[PDB]
Amino acid sequence: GILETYMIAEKITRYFTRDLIELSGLLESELSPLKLLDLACGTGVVSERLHEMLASKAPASWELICGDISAELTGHVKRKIIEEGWTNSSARVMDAQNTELATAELTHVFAALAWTSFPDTYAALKDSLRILRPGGTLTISTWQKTEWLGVLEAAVKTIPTRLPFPTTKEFMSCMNPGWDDENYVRGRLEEAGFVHVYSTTISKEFQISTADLYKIAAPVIPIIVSKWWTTEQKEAHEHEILPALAKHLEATYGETGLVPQKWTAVFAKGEKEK
Numbered sequence: 001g002i003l004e005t006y007m008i009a010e011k012i013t014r015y016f017t018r019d020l021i022e023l024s025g026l027l028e029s030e031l032s033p034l035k036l037l038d039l040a041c042g043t044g045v046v047s048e049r050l051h052e053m054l055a056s057k058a059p060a061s062w063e064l065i066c067g068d069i070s071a072e073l074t075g076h077v078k079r080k081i082i083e084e085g086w087t088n089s090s091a092r093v094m095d096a097q098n099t100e101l102a103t104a105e106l107t108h109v110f111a112a113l114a115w116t117s118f119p120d121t122y123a124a125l126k127d128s129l130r131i132l133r134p135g136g137t138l139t140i141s142t143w144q145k146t147e148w149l150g151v152l153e154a155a156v157k158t159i160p161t162r163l164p165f166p167t168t169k170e171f172m173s174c175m176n177p178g179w180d181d182e183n184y185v186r187g188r189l190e191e192a193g194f195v196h197v198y199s200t201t202i203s204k205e206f207q208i209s210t211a212d213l214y215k216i217a218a219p220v221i222p223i224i225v226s227k228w229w230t231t232e233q234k235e236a237h238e239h240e241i242l243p244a245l246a247k248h249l250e251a252t253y254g255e256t257g258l259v260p261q262k263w264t265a266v267f268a269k270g271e272k273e274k
């Protein structure tokens, strides 16, 4: 049912899929037959970009699997496969920590903005390592700075009480700390047995509508409140957050309705030996 909120999110994550595919080396791979996995695919933005960037290639030269833990999202990708006529693509519900795909028969695994969500991140790395063929590549990205958070911070400041609010580091570190750091990420892939691990940081500058920024912040408010507010603060003031965000958005960005944004993700790649 939280499919409607991923529809807003995918407007942003689309800006990060091309660098993921470029980083992976897929467009210059001599591995054959190409067998790709869009792991934790959400609404399938990586799969979208794969079919665009591979448009010149013989459609029989590659196949794609899309997997997500959610059945609503998988079903969305499955309807996309059918509507767009992706005959070489299939979608299935799967757990990234234990995919039940066959050992050593993928050439590339792509996992965009997902690894921080995995409760056992090492188990997901070993599984992806297992399902890759020798010489195959795992390519991932994770958020490091997402600038909607600061717009919400400013909104919360206008609330008539000094209320706690997390910094980017405190927020990003809520689950799986360290994945917002390119050096930590590289070490984790190296410790799992990937070789030729490379890590970097990539920013995108874009504009988002005030309305879209509201819809992004709304599902995250109860999470922020539960972890950084006392229960007394939650019960006295949570109902004030959304009204103040809307008020702050229009007063600050209402002339054009556009919010300039700069988000940064770490990207990383690792290879299975041989």
Ligand SMILES: Nc1ncnc2c1ncn2[C@@H]1O[C@H](CSCC[C@H](N)C(=O)O)[C@@H](O)[C@H]1O
Residues within 6 Å of the ligand: 009, 010, 013, 039, 040, 041, 042, 043, 044, 045, 046, 067, 068, 069, 070, 073, 094, 095, 096, 097, 111, 112, 113, 114, 117, 118, 119
């Ligand atoms: N253990 C797990 N196995 C597979 N998918 C998982 C998972 N835990 C969370 N997810 C999925 O990970 C996604 C994170 S959002 C990232 C979505 C997409 N790759 C994009 O770029 O927009 C969500 O769709 C969620 O359903």
